[PDB]
Amino acid sequence: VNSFSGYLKLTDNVYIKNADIVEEAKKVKPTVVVNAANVYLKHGGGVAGALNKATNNAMQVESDDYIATNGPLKVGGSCVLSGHNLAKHCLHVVGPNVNKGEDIQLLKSAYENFNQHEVLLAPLLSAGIFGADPIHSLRVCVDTVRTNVYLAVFDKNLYDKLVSSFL
Ligand SMILES: Cc1cc(S(=O)(=O)N2CCC[C@H](C(N)=O)C2)cnc1N
């Protein structure tokens, strides 16, 4: 049993809710919240900008030190950093950004990072300002992630479309 509430069950291991991931993280304090990161961990907008703002920029400060030491992530890759006031840990995962021309096949590799964590609160990778089709992202999630994932979808209209079109 876990503390996630109000989710619709899509499969054995994937759950979905219309929710603001920031507000959901603040309330559950999950072991892992996933950030929709870029390779530079520049948390300017989208989910990343919102998560970072909720940490009062502490996520960005930590991230800048990480990059100065380690260099950029790979598209499809990830790193574990602090969850600050939102979660124990933040898994920063880089999905391909269609608006930069990155290969959507890398979306499966991005979701594979979730399998290193037993339970996660997450957004749909490569959705929103990353330009991919969220219906496709949900399909890849379901077909790739085997651990227990609680997906937060900000937009109510999109949430309803994702549920109603789910096979
Ligand atoms: C292994 C496991 C993790 C989680 S959790 O990452 O979401 N988190 C962990 C910390 C306490 C949180 C809570 N508010 O109880 C729930 C939930 N259930 C589980 N069986």
UniProtKB/Swiss-Prot annotation:
Q: Where would you find this protein in the cell?
A: Host endoplasmic reticulum membrane
Function summary:
Responsible for the cleavages located at the N-terminus of the replicase polyprotein. Participates together with nsp4 in the assembly of virally-induced cytoplasmic double-membrane vesicles necessary for viral replication. Antagonizes innate immune induction of type I interferon by blocking the phosphorylation, dimerization and subsequent nuclear translocation of host IRF3. Also prevents host NF-kappa-B signaling. In addition, PL-PRO possesses a deubiquitinating/deISGylating activity and processes both 'Lys-48'- and 'Lys-63'-linked polyubiquitin chains from cellular substrates.
Question: Quaternary state and partners of this protein?
Answer: May form homohexamers. Interacts with N protein.
Species whose genome carries this gene = Severe acute respiratory syndrome coronavirus 2
Protein encoded by which gene: rep
**Catalysed conversion reaction:** Thiol-dependent hydrolysis of ester, thioester, amide, peptide and isopeptide bonds formed by the C-terminal Gly of ubiquitin (a 76-residue protein attached to proteins as an intracellular targeting signal)
What's the protein called, per UniProt? Papain-like protease nsp3
Q: Which residues form the Macro domain?
A: 1-167
| Membrane topology of the entry | Multi-pass membrane protein
Effect of changing residue 164 to L: reported as:
In strain: Gamma/P.1
Anything known on activity regulation?
Inhibited in vitro by GRL-0617.
